[PDB]
Amino acid sequence: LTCGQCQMNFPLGDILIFIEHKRKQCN
């Protein structure tokens, strides 16, 4: 997944990381 806030791209199977960032790291 890719998030503009963190401006980073992730390959398939790494969606878990995206959720964590948007959890408490993406405020």
The residues that touch Zn ion, with contacts defined as CB under 5 A, are 3, 5-6, 21, 26
Element (H, E) at 25: none
CA angle 18, 27, 1 (to 5 degrees): 15
Query: Measured from the CB of residue 9, what is the shortest distance to Zn ion in angstroms?
Result: 12
Query: Measured from the CB of residue 21, what is the shortest distance to Zn ion in angstroms?
Result: 5
Residue 3 marked as a ligand binder: yes
Output 3 or 17, the one with its CB closest to Zn ion. 3
Write down the residue that tokens 């408490």 correspond to: 24
Output 13 or 27, the one with its CB closest to Zn ion. 27
Measured between alpha carbons, how far is 9 from 3 in angstroms, rounded to an integer? 7
